[PDB]
Structure formats: structure tokens, C-alpha cells
Structure 1
Amino acid sequence: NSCSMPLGMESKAISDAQITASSYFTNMFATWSPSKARLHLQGRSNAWRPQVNNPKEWLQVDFQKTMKVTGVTTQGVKSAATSMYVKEFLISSSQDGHQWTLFFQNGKVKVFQGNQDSFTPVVNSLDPPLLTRYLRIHPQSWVHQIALRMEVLGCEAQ
């Protein structure tokens, strides 16, 4: 129970450089960049959104070391009056950036059940816990548009 602390998305101990994505939506007034994918961030473009909405987009955190990951927390966003949130997602991970592993639950790729609105954070436990350096989230279903603010829960790999 001693390995459930936020690893730094909300606090910015995970720096902007550490968060990347397949793509992200940007125009003259908005940058829905990967580094906006931070739990409870407020503002005009306060979430990651991919450039196009499709099930092959992804958001990635690089912890810059191997960490013990025991949960992921996700949250949608509101763009003015429009609610946008991910309902279902997959996770993949890597210790070196070369070899990736899809997150399985007892022999089957786990489909995580995510958000049901644009504001409530949903915590998804990872059992078994992940010892990883890169963590990728793969949205599979969503309401209106893909949008993510997140936190990673865990501890150092000691």
C-alpha cells in the first residue's frame, strides 16, 4: 500500500520534455500538447488531444528511469461546452524504448475502462504492477474526441 504516490504529472516533477505523443492538435489559439495531459490542469487547451481521432494514436510518459507503476489515473476535458473523454484504453510499456510489452490481465490484453465524464478522475490499478521506463496509453473508445489529463501512481523501483 506504500507504492501509490503520484509520480509527477500534476506536480510537474515529470517535465514537459518527458511527455510525448503520436500527434497533437494545435492552431493559432490552442496547443493540446502531450505536456498538457496533467491531472486537473485548467486553461484553454488543458489536455492532450491527438491531431486526428483514431484508435492508433497514443500518449507516452518517459520516467527517465525504471519506476514501479501501480496505477494510472485518467480524466477527460471540456473545450468550452464540449465534453471529451476516453472511455476505454490499452497500455503498453518498455524498459529501453526498443522492446515493448502490451499490458495483459491473466493471458488477455487488458482493456481498461476509463472515463464517463469530462471532470472526474478514474484510477485504474495495474495488477500486476509494471516495472517500466516508458508508459504508453492507447485510446480505443471515446466520447466526442480523444482528450487526456493523467497521473501515474507508484514509487521508485527499490
Structure 2
Amino acid sequence: MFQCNVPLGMESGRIANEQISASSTYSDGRWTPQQSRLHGDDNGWTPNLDSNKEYLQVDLRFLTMLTAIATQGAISRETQNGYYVKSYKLEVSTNGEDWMVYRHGKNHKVFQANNDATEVVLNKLHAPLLTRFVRIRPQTWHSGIALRLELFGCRV
């Protein structure tokens, strides 16, 4: 039987590079948005400044049921230093213009994320959500923001 919890294409490449963008990226061009795929081997995504107004954005191109998000940090291949997001908020949109921060109850959902730079932490949405665009918005981090990502659900 089919279950709506399959990887949507970060690791597989089904989500093409052009579908992945960010608010900003670190100025040396060694931590680009396209380095944010789960199990990516060369660093990860890092914004130009570490702040809670930065985000990594995925355009799924079609309305898609989203059921879970997995994240990693990353180890710098230059320094061996580890960076990871400890918590984040999710922003979603059907059209790329009207954005809503994901809530559980009256308040924004704060997802607890990584506690090292290497392991995958999976968070399920409290209900499946029909969306086209996804933004991961780091709120807290260790040493600095670095992300690798997979999205889970199913194409409706």
C-alpha cells in the first residue's frame, strides 16, 4: 500500500538545482543553496550572515503533500569545523507570494533539529500540508548556520 512519506527529491536530484534558492549565501561561494541536499558530501548551505531572517527555499513546482522534513548540519571540508541548525521555523506557500509561517496551535511551530553536524533528524508535520514552496528558517544554531535537507510526502 502507498504511504505519503516518500523523499521528494533533494537526495535523488528529482528536485533540480534551479528549484533550490536562498535568502543569501556565504560570499566565498563554498556553501551554496545547491549544497543543501541530504547526505551531500561538500559542505552544505550557509547564508551570508548567521541570523534568524535567513532561509533556504525549495520550489516543488506543483502542489505537493508535505508530511516531514529531515535536516543535517555540515562539516567544513576545509577546516573540519562542524556547523548545525538546532531549531527552525517552516514557511509555506502555494503561489510563492502569500507566505504563512507553520503553526501548531495559536503559535509558530518551532522544530527541534540537529545536535551535531552529521546525523539526520526527522520531524513530522502534525498534519500533512498541501504546499508548493517550502522555506526552512533557522532560529538557533551551533557555531553557525549550515543545512542539508530532505523533504517527505507525496505528489498529489
**SS, match of residue 20 in structure 1:** strand
After TM superposition, the score normalised by the length of structure 2 is 0.95
Unaligned runs of 5+ in 1: none
Q: CA RMSD in A?
A: 1.1
Corresponding residue for residue 81 of structure 1: 80
Q: Does 1:66 align with 2:63?
A: yes
Q: Which amino acid aligns with 1:55?
A: N
Is the 1:24–1:32 Cα contact (8 Å) retained in structure 2? yes
Could you tell me the TM-score, scaled by structure 1's length? 0.93
Matches of 2:22 and 2:72 in 1, distance apart?
Answer: 17
Aligned partners of 1:26 and 1:33 also within 8 Å: no
Alignment of 1:119-134 (within 5 A): 119-134=118-133
- 1-side partners of 2:56 and 2:97: how far apart? 17
**Correspondence 1:49 to 2:51:** no
* Partner Cα distance (2:37, 2:85) in 1: 14
Determine the C-alpha separation between the residues in 2 that align with 1:143 and 1:112: 15
| Partners of 1:41 and 1:97 in 2: CA distance | 26
List structure 1 segments (4+ residues) > 4 angstroms apart after TM superposition: none
Q: Who is 2:32 aligned against?
A: 33
